[PDB]
């Protein structure tokens, strides 16, 4: 019974006809799938690991210099040599300094000076390549079945159970068939390669701390760097980045090695994502995974059960989840055995016609023990109602109010869909996907518009997006012709919303 009270939750309703639905398993969110006569299963992407890592480059942020030496040549001579310019472990700089009889030779003006310092690195940061293969997705699926509120704790404890199944999708094995004993099996046709676009993402490491950085960012940061293949005593390429040569007014030249640069690159790591390592593998989060859910072998477990005929008792007060949905936990005083829990809700208790909906879709007591408890979940209608559990006269009830009006629920659905379109781009059209030509046409149009948008506004931050968006609204509202005005207004609104949605 995971996915309950996660505040980033989705409800996909498998349409009648067709046994498959498309979902986008976002890392951090979750989704519960409920078909017309199938048990409700909530599915969450828990871990994303990268198994094989190839060192691509190793920058330096804690350089040091030890052996300082200088050579000078008088004016109208050649150039100073110092014999250390033949050593690649040293960084050197040639400059012109004032020379004269006081300095100790014949002519006056613009001698040649060279300073060399032995470069060493004390702390280096390593980037690693990530291939779209050899990364493994883990997926936790829990069935709205027997278990009570009491097994949601330690949700990261991916323990397989009678109601909990763990699948492990890889680009080599993207089609696992998840078997949940009793409820049948769930089919997953996942797309591991089209996730976070790990091709353009290295795995930065610096001081036992890891990030997931873009390729261009890692290749465009100026520091002394050596190739990943460089093993042993590294040969540092751009030593001049961490070493500054300054000349006394016109007399000498001094070398200094700059600071630790760790905070500088932390500030440079702005839009990056933190990541962990399990010892050799890049365990991470914040990705997403597109899967196709095959509900063929899913079906309700205890349909042939008889209704529970004994006194149910509430053990916890029904609690509203963050999406207008009420959680109910009850205790059974009967010892008859595995039985159907009779639960519904009605606006009026005289003609107790069922109203609203039920998420669990088959509440069942599965224990023959005297006092056993189970957990439910309902989708009440907007307004007042009653959560009635039990058959006879010894039933129990709980007055319930739901404040989510239909228009308000539609607005929340719209903002949730817009947020997922902002986060996922065109992949958001694959979340409610069950097929359809309107869906495909809209996804294609969004694909081409998003490609144009990425080309025109790709590298831009929150503040820059806001600035250009405001300028575009102005270039909209105040414009001669309406077509260009419409385009400018649309682009400005899209940029402002893209900043706001992550901001809000």
């Amino acid at each position, epitope marked *: 019974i995971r996915c309950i009270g996660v505040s980033n939750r989705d409800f996909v309703e498998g349409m009648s006809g067709g046994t498959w639905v498309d979902v986008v398993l976002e890392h951090g969110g979750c989704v519960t799938v409920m078909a017309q006569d199938k048990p409700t299963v909530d599915i969450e992407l828990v871990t994303t690991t990268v198994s094989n890592m190839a060192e691509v480059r190793s920058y330096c942020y804690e350089a040091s210099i030890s052996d300082m030496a200088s050579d000078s040549r008088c004016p109208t001579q050649g150039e100073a040599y110092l014999d250390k310019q033949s050593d690649t472990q040293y960084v050197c700089k040639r400059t012109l300094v004032d020379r004269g009889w006081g300095n100790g030779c014949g002519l006056f003006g613009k001698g040649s000076l060279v300073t060399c310092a032995k470069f060493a690195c004390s702390k280096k940061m390593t980037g690693k390549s990530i291939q779209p293969e050899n990364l493994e997705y883990r997926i936790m699926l829990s069935v709205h079945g027997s278990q009570h509120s009491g097994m949601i704790v330690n949700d990261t404890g991916h323990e*397989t*159970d*009678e109601n*909990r199944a763990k*699948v492990e999708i890889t680009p080599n094995s993207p089609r696992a068939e*998840a078997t949940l*004993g009793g409820f049948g099996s769930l089919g997953l046709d996942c797309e591991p390669r089209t996730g976070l676009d790990f091709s353009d993402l290295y795995y930065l490491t610096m001081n036992n701390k890891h990030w997931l950085v873009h390729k261009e960012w890692f290749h465009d940061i100026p520091l002394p760097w050596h190739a990943g293949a460089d093993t042993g005593t590294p040969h540092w390429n751009n030593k001049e980045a961490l070493v500054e040569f300054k000349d006394a007014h016109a007399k000498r030249q001094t070398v200094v090695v700059l600071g630790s640069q760790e905070g500088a690159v932390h500030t440079a790591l702005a839009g990056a994502l933190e990541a962990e390592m399990d010892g050799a593998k890049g365990r991470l989060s914040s990705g997403h995974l597109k899967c196709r859910l095959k509900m063929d072998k899913l079906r309700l477990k205890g349909v042939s059960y008889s209704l529970c005929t004994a006194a149910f008792t509430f053990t916890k007060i029904p609690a509203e989840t963050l999406h207008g949905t009420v959680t109910v936990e009850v205790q059974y005083a009967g010892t008859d055995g*595995p039985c159907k829990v009779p639960a519904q809700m009605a606006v009026d208790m005289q003609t107790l016609t069922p109203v609203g909906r039920l998420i669990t879709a088959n509440p069942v007591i*599965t224990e023959s*023990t005297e006092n056993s408890k189970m957990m439910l979940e309902l989708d009440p209608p907007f307004g007042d109602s009653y959560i009635v559990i039990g058959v006879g006269e010894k039933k129990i009830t709980h007055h319930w109010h739901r404040s989510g009006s239909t228009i308000g629920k539609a607005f929340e659905a719209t903002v949730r869909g817009a947020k997922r379109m902002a986060v996922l781009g065109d992949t958001a059209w694959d979340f409610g996907s069950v097929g359809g030509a309107l869906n495909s046409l809209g996804k294609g149009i969004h694909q081409i518009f998003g490609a144009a948008f990425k080309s025109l506004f790709g590298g831009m931050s929150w503040f820059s997006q806001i600035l250009i968006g405001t300028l575009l609204m102005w270039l909209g509202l105040n414009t001669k012709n309406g077509s260009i005005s419409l385009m400018c207004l649309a682009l400005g609104g899209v940029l402002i919303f893209l900043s706001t949605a992550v901001s809000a």
Partner: antibody
Amino acid sequence: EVHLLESGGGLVQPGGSLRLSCAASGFTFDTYAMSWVRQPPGKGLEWVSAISTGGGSKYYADSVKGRLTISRDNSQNTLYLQMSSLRADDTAVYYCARSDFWRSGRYYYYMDVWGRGTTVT
Amino acid sequence: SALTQPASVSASPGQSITISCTGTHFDIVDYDYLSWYQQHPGNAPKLLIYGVSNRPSGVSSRFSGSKSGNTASLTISGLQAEDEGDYYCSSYSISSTLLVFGGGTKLSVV
């Protein structure tokens, strides 16, 4: 190779208790859901209890439920069974069997490797 | 919802003996989670067939399982003398007692 060794079996007066123990080797004991099966002398097998890969879920048959508790300890790679309120009906040999009950992908509620068994009276 | 098995069967070597297992709707008709076990006296049981038809590595092809309705049967072709021993069927039950076993058939080779 894959060996399961039991211990603790023996003679116990009716109405008492007893502490079984099954040892595991070879396979990764933490990734396998282990089950408990008994057979009274001259009679058929009956599955008694099963535990999850981590001990977070326990299952029992509706003849020993409330009378036995199955526990595992992953660090020492061993699994136990807790007798309680014993009686003559519990006189059997207890087989420690490795199960594929809930692992990943597809399973079929079968048992691969079984222990030698221990005698209980 | 216990499984019922024939008490005993007898067959001569070189023939085929069909052992059968039948149960209620709680364990058989809906589930392929059906496993067959054989047990020599004073020995641990051994799995021959899992998932109705599939067979573990290291098990002879003579054992072939099948299911049809309330009853599922296991067939042993080319019977030998060492095939003597008890045979059990286990299934997954939607009730208490998650796994239920058959009554146990004493196979005899004549």
